[model samples]
Target: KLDIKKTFSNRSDRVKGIDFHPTEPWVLTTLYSGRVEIWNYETQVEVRSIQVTETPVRAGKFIARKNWIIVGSDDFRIRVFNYNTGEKVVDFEAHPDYIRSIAVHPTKPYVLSGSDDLTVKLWNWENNWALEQTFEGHEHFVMCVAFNPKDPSTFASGCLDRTVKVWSLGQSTPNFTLTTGQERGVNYVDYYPLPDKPYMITASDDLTIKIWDYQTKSCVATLEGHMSNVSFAVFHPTLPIIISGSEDGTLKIWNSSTYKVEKTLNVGLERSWCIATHNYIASGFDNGFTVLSLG
Candidate 1:
């Protein structure tokens, strides 16, 4: 079992997205109210915050290369800020509609955004936030996007159209699509984070989490324990477990090898929307965000 290390409550708003500072106790939570709060979990205090937009900030991530926090809003804008000083550096309309999700490249200057515009776009930060590529294929809104840790050139998109598309960086079309026509939306996708494993995990509104063999382009495993819609699922960076946040207000840890449940924690926070990891796991929920530990 894991312990709840620390928690911060807005008490009135849902945290739409969350991320961890690369080497600090800082955890960034973007609210449905358009505020970005940076909390120092170790110190148990909020160190800084920025009023990001009048519309909700749907997602946020720490861009270590520039000491910036990149965030997306329902207003279709993506903005970058100096996390330490609350300084807005760049702001631009990223999509024709809402920016549903945002992801930072682990080793590149690129940012991937999934939008209500039915496209997944790639932006290069080193090139003055230039729009590098716009991938279009999903029949409906793109809900989530992610970059493979081992191969940054390879990326994936999950959409409400009930398909997950894997794409190569420069290629115009997807390598393939994983069908979920069996249900509704695909809300999140995560990489296995290594070269040896060619696997991907997807969270969906279909009430189950999936493990995909990307090379074979097939669904190899389906984890079926979540009682409600699974909002987010990702492989722990250094652990042999998959951590998932769901609308059931729980965090479920599953053994990656056996595809069996390890533990389940009912957070009692209404529902969880996002999960991020550094040294500890931080999950955003309906009322607040909490820091947790598993060792």
Candidate 2:
């Protein structure tokens, strides 16, 4: 069983993205109202609040080594802010449409962004934050992007075009395009933490999560339980467990080995987003967010 360690209900809008600090006891949350709040999970108090714009902030995360926070906004730009000073350090127009998702390379200085313009772009922030490459393939809005746990040169993206494409750093085209044999659009994609596994997981509007073997270019398992769109899904940092959130207002934890749901929590909202790190799980909903102490 997971125990509710804390609850925060001060936000007036729904959370669009949530990420944990790589080495700190803190979490960053972006909301539909263009507010980004950083909270100290250990003390259950907000440490910082950053207002990037009047437009909605779609996603944000801490660049741990650099001590900076990068965020995507509905204004079609990516903004970087200093973690301690709360000062704007960098801002650039990244796409023709709203920037929906952003992911930083595991060990490199590259940043990947997906947008409603149906494209994925790679930025080399180390070198004057230049645009290194742009990948064009999705027929609809590009929704999510994730870098492989072991390979910084490779990453995967999910799109509203109902496909997931994997690309290499310098490649102009996708190396693999994964189709689930369904018509539903994908909402999120994430690579397994194990470097040797070569597997990826995706959440879709069809209310299912599919585990794909990248080497074989095939889905190995399909997990179903959510009654509505599956918004986000991620693997536990150091465990063979998968956690998912949905528009149906529940968070489900699955045992990856058995491909079965081990537990479910009713978050009491029409939509929910979740992130897990170490032994803790954080879930955001319509009214607020909650942190769970997991086994």
Candidate 3:
């Protein structure tokens, strides 16, 4: 089970993206007001809040030891900043359309970004954020992309076309496709964080999250509980749990072993947009974010 540890108030605009510092007590959230705020959650103090763009900052991620923050904006560009200096370091027009979601590799010096331009792109931060490859096959907007923790050389992308395409590092095409063909589209996709588990999860606009066996290319389980579009779903880093956030204003914790809803949280913030887990669960919502911990 999970219990609310803290609820941070926005008093401004809707919160879109969230991420936790790798080895610190900080959490950062992107806002629809075009601002990104870093909070020292344990101390309940705002560390650094920067007005990055006039458009919505849809996603934020920490590039760990570099002390850099990367964000995707509605303005069709990805901007990188030094979290300590509050300076814009790298700003690249990553896509022709809105940048949706981005992820950093577990050990590699790379970034994976999906865009409304109907493509997913890989960038090498080690090479100064140069475009490594473009994965183009989605007929509609690419909503999310994630690297395989078990094997970083491969990745997955979820598209508005309602399919999940699995691609390898050097290939322009997918190794295989999971044709979801749902009513709306796929919203988020993530691989199981540990090795030896050939599993991945996908959240859909159809209000469901499905677990798939990538090696066998089959759906192993379907998790249904959300009332609206399922925005994010991920396997817990060190627990037998699956945490999912939704536009329906709830964060549902599912038992990974049984695929059953174990607990649900609604701390008054509606429309959960993004969720990032470090030591605890920090989920972004329409108003702000709620941090919870497993007991």
Off by over 4 Å in 2: 1-12, 274-278
Better of 1 and 3 by TM-score: 3
Of the candidates numbered 1 and 2, which has the greater lDDT value? 1
lDDT of 2: 0.84
Error of 2 at 113 (Å): 0.5
Q: Give the TM-score of candidate 3.
A: 0.96
Candidate 3 lDDT, tens digit per residue, 195-260? 768899999989989999998888899999899999999998988899999989898989999999
Q: Tens digit of lDDT per residue, candidate 1, span 1-295?
A: 4454445444537999998887887889999999988888878788788888889998898897788999999988999998767788999999989998997877888899999999999999889999999999998989889888788788899998988998999899998888855377899989998677899888888788988888887788999888888999999998888999999999998988999998888877889999997838889889888887664
Clash pairs of candidate 2? none
**Superposition-based RMSD of candidate 3 using all C-alpha atoms, in angstroms:** 1.5
lDDT of 2 by residue, 201-236 (tens): 899889899998989988889999999988888888
User: Would you list the C-alpha lDDT of every candidate in the order shown?
Assistant: 0.87, 0.84, 0.88
Report lDDT (Cα) of residue 164, candidate 1: 91
Q: Residue-pair clashes per candidate, as listed?
A: 0, 0, 0
